[model samples]
Target: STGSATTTPIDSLDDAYITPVQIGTPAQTLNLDFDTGSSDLWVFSSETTASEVDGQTIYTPSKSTTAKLLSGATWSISYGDGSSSSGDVYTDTVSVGGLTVTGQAVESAKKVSSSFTEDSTIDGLLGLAFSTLNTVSPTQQKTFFDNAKASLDSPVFTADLGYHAPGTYNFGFIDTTAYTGSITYTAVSTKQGFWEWTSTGYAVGSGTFKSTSIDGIADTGTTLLYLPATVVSAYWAQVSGAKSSSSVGGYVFPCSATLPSFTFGVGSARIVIPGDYIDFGPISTGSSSCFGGIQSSAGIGINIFGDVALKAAFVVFNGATTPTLGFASK
Candidate 1:
């Protein structure tokens, strides 16, 4: 994760961030992150202590008249980066834009620190992606996706990254102008909580390199794209005169010439990883050697297609049924 905070509060739109969708009687206001890493919706509450709730935007029940706290319910969440938060359960009417999904489930973490509290801008997470690693009960808890089906065109949600602020996380329709026409989607193996795809192949310079279909997962929580070793070396080889330089943990490389763009073909969707994020300084610097993509993660099972890659395309996660993954124009 980049540890960059880009969340900016607007002049308060009647329907921004959380849209009122009648999930409750009047609907609760919910914050949505087009997250693919996990499947859950959480909110901060009044029960949290000041130290535990530091640097967070808690959704106080008193703030919303429609808020509903789950009686005797408590939960906690831990991120891959060893950061966690725990608090009581509270329900409220949540909305996104004009779409309303009321009485949605929200987790109130009493103690949220380390990475999330220190790094992230928003206080809550609404997991719209399809995965089996659910923060909520598949049998009992209903996601915003399950509730927003009525107002949307398809049982789908699309997120488009803008040049600046809160690009566009659409609820129903996909904006064709924002991305390439066809989306090469793969099936989701319900065992994990990710809508993952396998990259058919990789192309770097004139090297006759062939990498195994990389397991690609679109993760909003992660800030960069993480790949395996073989794929990393093969792709970096394409950088003209670019040798292994240990800078930034070998995750970055600095090439003299205008490094040719690297494309990651995920089934049908072809994505290019920019060079600015790829290039690193010389070996003299006390940084890790630079690879094609970030190679710091040696054996972290996830083939991360994080926000950097995701921001370039309009991604769609169809949860209407399992074994499904779809992509379209943003």
Candidate 2:
């Protein structure tokens, strides 16, 4: 069997991508954010704090006949963005797109932080990273993918994120017609429970390709592309009015500047990011200054190739005995 979930950007900023998922015996459907950067399938539930239930569709375990409480189980997680949620655990039937997995661990939130309550677009998140990142204490739980992969025709999943368009997240067999040309596969390191890899270098526009190796993780949950300052500063220097501003923060420039398309080499494959992608629209409503998608990774420590870069190509996350990542132009 296979799973193919269609995801769409929540808003114009592309802050988050959401997909509808069905859980429990009767299958109550809710919009979920599929985050590759973390592990732990959590949801806004009837168990959540009463006051925190602003405008989300909560999952009611008592309404599902197949729902079972996992005794002595609890989980707590905090995201890099400072948003957090935690609660007890329940095992139930979980379905995404066309596939279903029984006895899947579903973390039901009893408490939530402000960021989650303030954003009404998402009901919760489905983490796709390695099971090692699972937050359940005492006895860890496998991710939905980790449990579903054994019966899948192929033990792999692909992320097809789009810009201002609908995206796809597929499990099991790959769709050949979705991309152009052959894929370039590279070895990935899961030491930190992330899809981390290295790139050969980068090129600004149609200029020479710089031969500098950069180590980073492929993250769909993240909204921006973060690279080294040396490369980030170099790319912005080409624009006439581009500058790092204290008030605006990061790199902001005249909205009318003729920005160059950015490209990065991946195992002899050059993936191109159109100049408009880096423009990031105007910094404010009707303001002439716009923010750049590419930013310095100094504060983050690890460079991140987020949606800004991922949306530009078709990406494959192969979970074989030895994990590997594949990228192709579409």
lDDT of 1 by residue, 9-125 (tens): 221210113222222344444344445676667654466666555554556666567667677766666766566666666576766665665676776666666555553345566
Model 2 Cα shift for residue 80 (angstroms)? 1.6
TM-score of 1: 0.76
What C-alpha lDDT, on a 0 to 100 scale, does residue 148 get in candidate 1? 66
Evaluate model 2: give its lDDT. 0.91
**Model 2 residue 248 CA deviation in Å:** 3.7
**Cα lDDT listed for each candidate:** 0.56, 0.91
Local accuracy of candidate 2 as per-residue lDDT tens digits, 1-330: 999999999998787899999999899998998988899999999999989989999999999999999999999999877789999999999999888999999999999999899888889999988999999988999999999999889999999988888989999978898889989998899999998999889999888999889999888888888999999999999999899887876889899898898898789998999987787878889999999899889878899999989988899989998999899988
List where candidate 2 sits over 4 angstroms from the true fold: none
Model 2 C-alpha RMSD vs. true structure (Å) is 1.4
